[PDB]
From a paper:
WW domains organize molecular assemblies by binding to short, proline rich peptide motifs each with ~4–6 residues. The type I WW domains bind to a consensus ‘PPxY’ motif (where P is proline, x is any amino acid and Y is tyrosine, also known as PY-motif) with very modest affinities (with Kd in the range of a few to a few tens of µM). To achieve this goal, we determined the high resolustion structures of 7 representative WW tandem/target complexes, and measured the binding constants of >100 WW domain tandems or isolated WW domains binding to known or previously unknown targets. In this study, we discovered that WW tandems, but not individual WW domains, can bind to target proteins with extremely high affinity and with very high sequence specificity.
Similar to the two PY-motifs of Dendrin that are separated by only two residues, the first two PY-motifs of [name] are also next to each other with only two residues in between, and the PY12 motif sequence is evolutionarily conserved. We found that the [name] WW tandem also binds to [name] PY12 with a super strong affinity (Kd ~8.2 nM). We further showed that [name] WW1 had a very weak binding to [name] PY12 (Kd ~32 μM) and [name] WW2 had no detectable binding to [name] PY12. Taken together, the above biochemical study revealed that the [name] WW tandem, via synergistic binding to the two PY-motifs immediately next to each other (i.e. PY12), can form a very tight complex with [name]. We solved the high-resolution crystal structures of [name] WW tandems in complex with [name] PY12, AMOT PY34 and LATS1 PY23. A residue in the PY-motif linker (R440 in [name], Q282 in AMOT and G553 in LATS) uses its carbonyl group to form a hydrogen-bond with the sidechain of Trp34. The sidechain of R440 of [name] also forms charge-charge interactions with D17 and D19 in β12 loop of WW1. Substitution of R440 with Ala weakened [name]’s binding to [name] by 17-fold. Second, the C-terminal extension of [name] PY12 tandem enhances its binding to [name] WW tandem by forming hydrophobic interactions with its WW1 domain. However, substitutions of the Pro residue with Cys, Ala, Ser, Thr, and Val lead to only mild weakening of the binding, whereas substitutions with bulky hydrophobic Leu, Met and Ile essentially disrupted the binding. The above results can be rationalized by the structure of the [name] WW tandem in complex with [name] PY12 showing that the pocket accommodating the residue (T442 in Figure 6A) is quite small. The extensive interactions between the inter-domain linker and the C-terminal helix couples the two WW domain into a structural supramodule in these WW tandems, thus providing a structural and thermodynamic basis for highly synergistic bindings to target proteins. For example, the formation of the WW tandem supramodule allowed [name] WW12 to bind to [name] with an ~3900 fold higher affinity when compared to the isolated WW domains.
Author numbering:
A (entry chain A): 6 to 94
B (entry chain U): 434 to 453
The structure:
């Protein structure tokens, strides 16, 4: 699947990828195709994958960190690992 | 330091205007 009609890929000032919906005049960090392809929760994830709405990013001062677009937050803790230690208990 | 704060997507109209 390619981008649905009306959607255009673009790059932010530092090259970070986002998506433009011209039909609704809005922008999003999330690829609309993720709404089909991404696993729904951390339970649905295998290997190193991230559920719908989560992004890993890099910061020169702190290293890798995580972005939850579902809640518009960022965190240093690895949510895949949090979820493992939670279901171990 | 500590983790970067959340970054909002760029504004649609702003993006359309900045293509000049
Ligand atoms: Cl539409
Ligand atoms: Cl927007
Ligand atoms: Cl978003
Ligand atoms: Cl769509
Ligand atoms: Cl979950
Ligand atoms: Cl920051
Ligand atoms: Cl402008
Ligand atoms: Cl303006
Ligand atoms: Mg106008």
């Amino acid at each position: 699947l390619p981008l649905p009609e009306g959607w255009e890929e673009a790059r932010d000032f530092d090259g970070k990828v986002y998506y433009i919906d011209h039909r609704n005049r809005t922008t999003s960090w999330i690829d609309p195709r993720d709404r089909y392809t991404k696993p729904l929760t951390f339970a649905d994830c295998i290997s190193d994958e991230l559920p719908l709405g989560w992004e890993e990013a890099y910061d020169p001062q702190v290293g890798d960190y995580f972005i939850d677009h579902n809640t518009k937050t960022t965190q240093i803790e690895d949510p895949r690992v949090q979820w493992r230690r939670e279901q171990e208990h | 330091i500590i983790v970067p704060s959340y970054r909002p997507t760029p504004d649609y109209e702003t993006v359309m205007r900045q293509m000049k």
